[PDB]
Amino acid sequence: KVEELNKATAAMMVPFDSVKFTGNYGNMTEISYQVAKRAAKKGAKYYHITRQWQENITISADLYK
Amino acid sequence: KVEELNKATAAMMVPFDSVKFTGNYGNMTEISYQVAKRAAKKGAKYYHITRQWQERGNNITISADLYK
Ligand SMILES: [Cl-]
């Protein structure tokens, strides 16, 4: 129920917070799950991932009501 | 159809090729679709993402190993 917006949708909206974290994830479904979990913890209904870095991976996503 | 593998599954398999490209991210669903399409064009049944860089929140550079 906590879903990722595409950039065109997110661009029209105002985020209330963001999440930023690092970890070792099996695939893109797992990355999305990890973001969604942190998003849901913060009361977001949606998110949009804004950064993905190599180093494990580091991910940053904006959160939306 | 073409399926994404997780790390442990891919680790036991041997890829035959990879895809590497840069394009519009959109969201994970949309980028996964782009990877799957390129995998399908090369004859793969599975892929595993090996690298990803999204550093300025527009484009993403990705690579993926391909498997039969
Ligand atoms: Cl795994």
Instruction: Give the total number of structural domains in chain A.
Output: 1
Structure-token pair, residue B18: 């990879």
CA separation, residue A15 to residues A6, A62, A64, B1 (Å): 13, 6, 5, 35
**Distance separating alpha carbons of residues A31 and A60, to the nearest angstrom:** 11
Where do the DSSP E strands lie in chain A?
A: 3-4, 17-23, 46-54, 57-64
**Distance separating alpha carbons of residues B33 and A59, to the nearest angstrom:** 20
Closest CA to B48 of A40, B2, A62: B2
**Distance separating alpha carbons of residues B43 and B58, to the nearest angstrom:** 29
The H or E element spanning position B20 is: strand B17-24
* Contact present, A48 and A36 (Cβ < 8 Å): no
CATH of the domain at A8: 3.30.1660.10
- Closest partner residue to A7 (CB to CB) among B5, B26, B48 is B26
Residues 23-52 of A with CB under 8 A from B: 26-32, 48-52
Domain of B48 in residue numbering reads as 1-68
Kindly give the interhelix angle for A28-41 and B28-41, rounded to the nearest 10 degrees: 180
Residue A2 forms contact with B (CB below 8 Å): no
Per-residue burial over A29-59, b if 16 or more Cβ lie within 10 Å, else e, is eebbebbbebbeeeebebbbbbebeeeebeb
Say which experimental method was used: X-ray
Cβ neighbours for B11, distance < 8 A, ≥ 6 positions apart: none
Chain B residues within an 8 Å CB radius of A7 = 24-27, 57-58
Cβ neighbours for A14, distance < 8 A, ≥ 6 positions apart: A64
**Distance separating alpha carbons of residues B52 and A54, to the nearest angstrom:** 7
| Chain A closest-CA separation from residue B61 CA (Å) | 10
**Distance separating alpha carbons of residues A32 and B15, to the nearest angstrom:** 24
Residue B57 forms contact with A (CB below 8 Å): yes
Structure-token pair, residue B43: 């004859």
The H or E element spanning position A38 is: helix A28-41
* Contact present, B51 and B62 (Cβ < 8 Å): yes
- Closest partner residue to A51 (CB to CB) among B8, B49, B57 is B57
Chain B residues within an 8 Å CB radius of A49 = 25, 27-28, 54
